[PDB]
Amino acid sequence: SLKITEVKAHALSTPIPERMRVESGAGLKLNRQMILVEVRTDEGVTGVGSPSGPYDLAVLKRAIEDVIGPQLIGEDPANINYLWHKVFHGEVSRNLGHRSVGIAAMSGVDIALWDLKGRAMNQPIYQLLGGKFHTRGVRAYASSIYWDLTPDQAADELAGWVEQGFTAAKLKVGRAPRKDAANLRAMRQRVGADVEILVDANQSLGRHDALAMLRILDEAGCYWFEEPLSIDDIEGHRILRAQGTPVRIATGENLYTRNAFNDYIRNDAIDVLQADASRAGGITEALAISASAASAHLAWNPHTFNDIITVAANLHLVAASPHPAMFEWDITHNDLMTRLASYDLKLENGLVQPPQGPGLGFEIDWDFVAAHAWKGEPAIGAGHGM
Amino acid sequence: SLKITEVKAHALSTPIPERMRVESGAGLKLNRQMILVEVRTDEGVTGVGSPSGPYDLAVLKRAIEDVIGPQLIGEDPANINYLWHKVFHGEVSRNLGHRSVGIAAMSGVDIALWDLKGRAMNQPIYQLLGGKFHTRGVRAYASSIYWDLTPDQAADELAGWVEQGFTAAKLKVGRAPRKDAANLRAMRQRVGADVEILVDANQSLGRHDALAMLRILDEAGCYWFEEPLSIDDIEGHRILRAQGTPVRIATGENLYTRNAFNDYIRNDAIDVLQADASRAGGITEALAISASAASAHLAWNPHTFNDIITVAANLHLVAASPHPAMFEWDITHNDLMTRLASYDLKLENGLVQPPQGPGLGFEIDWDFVAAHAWKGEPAIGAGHGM
Numbered sequence: 220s221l222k223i224t225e226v227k228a229h230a231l232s233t234p235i236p237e238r239m240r241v242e243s244g245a246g247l248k249l250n251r252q253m254i255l256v257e258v259r260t261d262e263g264v265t266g267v268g269s270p271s272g273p274y275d276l277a278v279l280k281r282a283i284e285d286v287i288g289p290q291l292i293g294e295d296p297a298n299i300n301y302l303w304h305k306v307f308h309g310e311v312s313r314n315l316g317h318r319s320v321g322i323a324a325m326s327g328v329d330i331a332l333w334d335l336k337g338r339a340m341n342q343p344i345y346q347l348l349g350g351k352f353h354t355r356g357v358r359a360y361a362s363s364i365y366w367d368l369t370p371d372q373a374a375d376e377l378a379g380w381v382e383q384g385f386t387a388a389k390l391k392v393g394r395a396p397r398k399d400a401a402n403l404r405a406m407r408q409r410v411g412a413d414v415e416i417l418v419d420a421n422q423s424l425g426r427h428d429a430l431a432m433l434r435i436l437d438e439a440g441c442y443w444f445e446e447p448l449s450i451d452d453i454e455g456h457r458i459l460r461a462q463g464t465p466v467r468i469a470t471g472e473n474l475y476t477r478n479a480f481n482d483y484i485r486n487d488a489i490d491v492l493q494a495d496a497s498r499a500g501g502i503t504e505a506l507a508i509s510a511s512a513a514s515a516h517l518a519w520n521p522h523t524f525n526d527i528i529t530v531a532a533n534l535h536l537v538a539a540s541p542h543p544a545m546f547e548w549d550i551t552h553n554d555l556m557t558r559l560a561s562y563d564l565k566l567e568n569g570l571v572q573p574p575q576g577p578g579l580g581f582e583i584d585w586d587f588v589a590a591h592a593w594k595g596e597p598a599i600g601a602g603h604g605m
Numbered sequence: 606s607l608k609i610t611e612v613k614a615h616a617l618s619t620p621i622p623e624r625m626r627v628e629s630g631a632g633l634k635l636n637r638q639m640i641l642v643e644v645r646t647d648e649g650v651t652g653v654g655s656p657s658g659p660y661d662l663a664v665l666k667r668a669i670e671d672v673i674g675p676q677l678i679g680e681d682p683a684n685i686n687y688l689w690h691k692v693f694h695g696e697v698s699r700n701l702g703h704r705s706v707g708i709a710a711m712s713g714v715d716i717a718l719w720d721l722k723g724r725a726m727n728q729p730i731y732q733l734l735g736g737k738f739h740t741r742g743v744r745a746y747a748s749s750i751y752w753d754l755t756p757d758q759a760a761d762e763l764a765g766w767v768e769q770g771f772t773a774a775k776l777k778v779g780r781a782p783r784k785d786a787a788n789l790r791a792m793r794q795r796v797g798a799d800v801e802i803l804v805d806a807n808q809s810l811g812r813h814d815a816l817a818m819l820r821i822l823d824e825a826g827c828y829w830f831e832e833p834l835s836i837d838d839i840e841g842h843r844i845l846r847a848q849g850t851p852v853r854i855a856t857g858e859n860l861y862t863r864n865a866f867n868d869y870i871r872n873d874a875i876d877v878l879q880a881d882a883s884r885a886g887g888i889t890e891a892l893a894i895s896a897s898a899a900s901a902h903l904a905w906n907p908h909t910f911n912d913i914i915t916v917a918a919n920l921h922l923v924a925a926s927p928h929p930a931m932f933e934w935d936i937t938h939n940d941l942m943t944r945l946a947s948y949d950l951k952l953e954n955g956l957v958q959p960p961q962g963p964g965l966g967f968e969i970d971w972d973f974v975a976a977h978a979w980k981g982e983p984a985i986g987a988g989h990g991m
């Protein structure tokens with residue numbers, strides 16, 4: 220058996236050309252950042268992970284190295300299940316908060332343990348998880364068309380992503396619902412019925428404006444309505460779902476652990492659970508959430524948006540899961556999606572395949588890592604919701 | 606009008622002699638720690654606060670100075686309501702997590718803004734809040750008799766607090782329910798019916814063991830059963846409450862914002878909301894939670910346990926609130942209760958009075974602060990629940 224010797228958190232920042240910054244309810248993007256988690260062992264088998272973002276990099280680094288890390292040093296990394304609970308009950312729930320950046324931190328470490336396990340076994344993570352369900356590949360969507368566009372421009376951008384091979388894409392909404400509606404109408408007219416259009420309000424709407432928008436989304440045949448409301452308003456989501464439209468009510472990037480999703484399910488408040496393996500507790504926790512969605516006859520389609528590691532970690536699980544595929548793929552300017560690792564976007568008939576190597580299944584460019592150390596740059600401007 | 610110039614977070618640690626270290630489901634106490642928040646203005650009016658604990662001090666310091674702080678610099682501190690929302694929607698909810706150490710961090714800053722406001726106005730916080738309801742003083746309880754005692758020892762400790770003037774005290778339970786039961790029985794026999802006995806399991810029990818223990822709490826006429834279960838199991842709390850006993854089901858030190866408590870209320874799952882002004886969002890947020898409890902014909906009795914600032918902040922609110930008083934007073938070894946400030950425990954006929962000075966109502970001993978800089982010591986050993 221191996222023993223964990225170090226838990227490291229590398230803070231990384233990559234720039235965004237001013238014109239390529241995009242804004243949603245989450246704020247105006249400034250620099251694409253991440254923590255690259257590195258778990259080392261006595262025999263030199265290493266796993267890597269990411270706790271997603273945007274979350275302050277110093278907060279993440281401290282939580283990972285100095286709160287979670289000490290619970291892992293000296294432990295057999297093979298006992299991922301034991302270690303999840305040791306960390307959650309020993310430190311994170313009480314001492315970082317039960318639905319928190321500490322849970323995202325745990326997630327990054329958990330992903331690294333799964334990567335380590337796959338590397339030790341010389342198997343891709345999806346093989347450990349029972350192998351593929353989606354044997355031919357996983358249907359992806361282009362994430363996302365952001366604010367600050369006219370309707371013709373939104374339609375142009377959608378048509379562009381479709382030309383690149385995407386069969387689905389997402390639109391950010393929430394600031395100016397009349398403009399959002401005009402954008403959606405133009406988008407649908409441009410591409411026709413065979414392209415799925417998803418909408419994401421980043422918690423920007425109140426209940427009544429969300430009900431008004433849902434009518435529009437229904438008219439436009441939208442696939443889902445993501446974060447239509449504050450994630451704190453469970454009943455509001457039930458109200459939207461109770462309208463009985465074919466538009467799925469989706470949320471989950473900002474909800475943590477299976478406990479959050481259980482509360483939504485018990486209140487008939489969710490169609491699509493979007494728990495991200497890199498945020499909601501780890502691969503370990505996302506597995507449980509995906510299963511719980513299926514038990515309730517609901518869907519799990521994770522949020523994946525931060526870096527190529529968060530994408531890859533979720534993709535292993537999605538490939539292995541019988542849930543209908545609607546796999547988030549960040550198409551915005553992001554060096555962490557292109558230059559961090561050897562795994563790249565490749566669409567065939569609208570589908571992507573999980574990485575095929577051991578663990579997460581690709582190689583990290585450590586020269587790139589060394590050249591992009593964080594120097595205190597901000598990731599994102601102030602969010603909305605006031 | 607003033608302008609905020611600096612938001613500082615002083616990391617402090619104070620030791621606990623070996624024999625004085627107590628253990629509960631939250632862990633074995635090692636050092637009593639805090640962040641002392643200091644908000645400065647251009648005209649030299651300063652407010653202080655605390656975001657409670659245990660939470661990692663470096664995580665807190667970074668969140669306060671470098672995540673929350675930048676949203677405050679240059680702002681008029683008088684607009685506490687505006688600033689709460691600027692911070693929550695701008696940064697904390699999404700970028701630190703909606704039920705998180707970030708919320709505790711916000712709470713410390715919010716308390717400091719209220720302290721600053723009171724100092725600027727030359728009024729105690731309770732006067733701003735509409736003045737006293739509890740004009741004669743606030744009934745307190747001794748917090749707490751911890752694990753590791755025999756029944757005779759538990760009864761003697763309780764009798765000791767009664768001799769000191771307390772009309773109520775709390776017992777920690779959950780590791781060995783048969784011993785817990787024996788302790789309670791001995792305690793009740795010793796003091797008779799006129800002393801309130803509270804019980805706190807620190808999330809240690811599952812549903813069936815909690816139902817079994819509730820029968821014994823009922824037999825012993827206990828006032829409340831605090832954190833009987835994981836705070837993530839709302840339905841389990843409903844089950845306990847549905848037994849219809851005179852024992853109140855209490856939770857809240859580990860639940861964040863009014864949203865958590867609304868979910869408990871909507872599920873008929875809570876009798877006593879324990880939202881702490883220094884954890885759950887601030888004085889601003891605790892005010893709303895207290896009001897919401899009253900609207901639902903339930904009680905708000907805050908958790909207050911970390912330092913004299915968290916005690917004082919809650920006491921101003923409790924003094925002003927019509928809720929029946931059951932005010933938590935940390936009687937364990939804690940230099941942050943005795944040496945940080947000029948305000949101390951003064952029990953008269955079982956009651957305490959809020960500080961009478963401006964703002965929080967006492968002065969900080971800055972020499973003590975300077976002499977107790979954190980040097981990386983841990984606050985608490987691994988918690989339980991696994």
Ligand SMILES: O=C(O)[C@@H](O)[C@H](O)[C@@H](O)C(=O)O
Pocket residue numbers: 629630631659748805807858908909910933
């Ligand atoms: O000592 C402990 O068990 C905790 O740190 C406290 O917060 C406790 O739950 C309480 O109600 O004051």
Ligand SMILES: [Mg+2]
Pocket residue numbers: 304307308990991
């Ligand atoms: Mg567990």
Ligand SMILES: [Mg+2]
Pocket residue numbers: 419421445446472522
């Ligand atoms: Mg989203």
Ligand SMILES: [Mg+2]
Pocket residue numbers: 604605690693694
């Ligand atoms: Mg608000």
Ligand SMILES: [Mg+2]
Pocket residue numbers: 805807831832858908
């Ligand atoms: Mg407690």
